[PDB]
Amino acid sequence: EVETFAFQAEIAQLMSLIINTFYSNKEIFLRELISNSSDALDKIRYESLTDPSKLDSGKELHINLIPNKQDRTLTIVDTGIGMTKADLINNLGTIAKSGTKAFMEALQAGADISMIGQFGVGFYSAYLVAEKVTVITKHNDDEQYAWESSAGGSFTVRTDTGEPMGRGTKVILHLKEDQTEYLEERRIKEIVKKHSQFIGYPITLFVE
Amino acid sequence: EVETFAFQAEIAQLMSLIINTFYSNKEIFLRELISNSSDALDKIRYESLTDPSKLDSGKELHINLIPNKQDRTLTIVDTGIGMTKADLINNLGTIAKSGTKAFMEALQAGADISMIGQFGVGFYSAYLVAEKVTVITKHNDDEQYAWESSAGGSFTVRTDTGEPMGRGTKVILHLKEDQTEYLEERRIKEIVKKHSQFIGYPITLFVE
Ligand SMILES: CC(=O)Nc1cc2nc(N)sc2cc1C
Ligand SMILES: CC(=O)Nc1cc2nc(N)sc2cc1C
């Protein structure tokens, strides 16, 4: 039922660096996760241009932000292309090995952590604020899977039992105890407005 | 031998807006074309992770900048994934219709033209400096094609007779007469350094 995998060495390094480096500008995590969602939504849109049946799993193309103070979770949901089992195992469809190298050579030459997205490993910025991340995904060519990691060198993949989602990806951020500001409506709004105001898909901030 | 196609209405509008709007910060075109090249290079890299034979058409992953003062051309060459005939016809593999809408709603709300890349139509920024653009491309699943457009509502596609390129995409910018500064070594260097210093693939600026 549950497979456990080792992160590649470069990715494990990246995650340990995100977790342990003092860096106050943590809010960028949300920009990078919304930007990944927008990329994935572009992808199914593009595909549907030539094969409309691709959207039979769902025609609405949107991003939802869902805070939950009781579980201490912030979830980013999109109806993008989703990920197959293989994509999830391949560092979530990232070029994470070569991107991590290029990120850390960039950091050697004066970049800061907010430029992570430029190396195609912006996902891992989730670890600025989360002690654990759970990704639920469904791609048209595969079944629903759950990926999970509390970092520490390893992740899991299983088939996901819960609510079918039709098509796309849900990132559930189990927030660090001192990072609950990212569950507040006003804070989320500020951040979206500041860093993601022109995203071309509607972003709905859910209330509690 | 040569097929002629109409741009979609939204794209034709976009191109006319790029061509006719007064906007002094034209240099951004190069950032956006390098960023497209980096995306395409990421794509073949990703694909090769699971199928190494994808790189039989060429293992080197790089971007070349080639100025030619005699032809008044600036060419951006990459060894990325390339484009199939169908991608080229579909506005160069862009979501150009929905992206153009989102770009122009963004411009209504205070964005400037330099944010074009955020709507996935950054290619068309070529028209800030070029009176004509020629794209030569080769994808592993298809033959070599040449796309061309001087804007004006139409583009052409033909099979390309010339030098085989193995795999990737070449953008040839036939520069406007008053935009020859983008053929000068010092200028290209300044622009790459300013806007593309952390791209993760080597960028080679050719001399004349
Ligand atoms: C096939 C593909 O590109 N899948 C994909 C979807 C996706 N959705 C997100 N929200 S991050 C993400 C990453 C990948 C690779
Ligand atoms: C298949 C695919 O994504 N092709 C692709 C390659 C490409 N190369 C560039 N330099 S722009 C570009 C656009 C597309 C769609």
- Residue listed under structure tokens 């500020």: A190
- Residues in Cβ contact with A110 at an 8 Å cutoff, skipping those fewer than 6 apart: none
Residues with CB under 6 A from ligand 2: B 36-37, 40, 43, 78, 80-83, 87, 92-93, 169
Range of the domain at A59: 1-208
For the CA of A42, the nearest ligand = 1
The Å distance, Cα B82 to ligand 2 centre, comes to 5
The span from the first CA to the last CA of chain A, in angstroms, equals 33
* Residue in A closest to B116 by C-alpha: A198
Structure tokens that stand for B198 in this block: 């952390």
Structure tokens that stand for A51 in this block: 């094969």
What part of B 74-113 touches A (C-beta under 8 Å)? 86, 90, 93-95, 98-99, 101-102, 106, 109, 111
* Residue in A closest to B43 by C-alpha: A95
CB B205 within 8 A of CB B77: no
Q: In what order do the strands lie in the sheet with A73-78?
A: A2-6, A154-159, A145-149, A130-138, A168-175, A73-78, A63-68, A203-205
What is the C-alpha separation between B4 and A125, in angstroms, rounded? 45
CB A5 within 8 A of CB A159: no
Closest in B45, B111, B120 to A42, CB measured: B120
Residue nearest to atom 9 of ligand 2 (CA): B37
Q: Give the CA diameter of chain B.
A: 47
Structure tokens that stand for B13 in this block: 């509008």
- Distances from the Cα of A167 to the Cα of A51, A85, A172, angstroms: 16, 14, 16
Residue B179 DSSP one-character state:
G
What part of B 31-50 touches A (C-beta under 8 Å)? 42, 45-46, 49-50
Task: Give the number of other Cβ atoms within 10 Å of residue B97's Cβ.
Answer: 18
Structure tokens that stand for B156 in this block: 């052409």
Structure tokens that stand for A103 in this block: 């990120």
> Angle A185-195/A28-50 helices, nearest 10 degrees?
60
Residue type, A26: K
- Concatenated DSSP letters of B158-169: EE--S---SSEE
- Distances from the Cα of B124 to the Cα of A52, A92, B66, B156, B172, angstroms: 26, 30, 19, 15, 13
| CATH number of the domain to which A85 belongs | 3.30.565.10
Question: Are residues A50 and B197, on separate chains, in Cβ contact within 8 Å?
Answer: no
Q: Where are the alpha helices (DSSP H) in chain B?
A: 9-20, 28-50, 85-89, 96-108, 185-195
**Among A36, A49, A116, which would you mutate to test the B interface (most chain B Cβ atoms within 10 Å of its Cβ)?**
A49
Give the CA angle between residues A131, A136, A140 to the nearest 5°: 155
Question: Are residues B200 and A111, on separate chains, in Cβ contact within 8 Å?
Answer: no
Beta bridge partners, B67, equal: B74
What is the C-alpha separation between A9 and B62, in angstroms, rounded? 25
For B147, phi then psi, to 5°, come to -100, 145
Q: Contacts of residue A119 in chain B, CB cutoff 8 Å? A: 198, 200
Closest in A49, A90, A120 to B49, CB measured: A90
Task: Say if residue B132 is exposed, middle or buried (CB neighbours under 10 Å; 0-12, 13-18, 19+).
Answer: middle
Please state the residue numbers annotated as binding site of A for ATP: 36, 78, 97, 123
Helices and strands in chain A: count of H runs, count of E runs: 5, 8
Q: How many domains does chain A have?
A: 1
> Angle B9-20/B96-108 helices, nearest 10 degrees?
50
Task: Say if residue B85 is exposed, middle or buried (CB neighbours under 10 Å; 0-12, 13-18, 19+).
Answer: middle
- Residue listed under structure tokens 């549950």: A2
Rounded to the nearest 10 degrees, how much is the dihedral formed by the CA atoms of A194, A199, A204, A205? -20
Closest by Cα among B122, B113, B129 to B94: B122
Q: How close is the nearest chain A Cα to the Cα of B10, in Å?
A: 15
For A188, phi then psi, to 5°, come to -60, -50
**Among A8, A32, A118, A198, which would you mutate to test the B interface (most chain B Cβ atoms within 10 Å of its Cβ)?**
A198
* Residue in B closest to A119 by C-alpha: B200
The Å distance, Cα B37 to ligand 2 centre, comes to 7
Question: Are residues A102 and B50, on separate chains, in Cβ contact within 8 Å?
Answer: no
Instruction: Report the nearest atom of ligand 2 relative to the CA of B93.
Output: 15
The span from the first CA to the last CA of chain B, in angstroms, equals 33
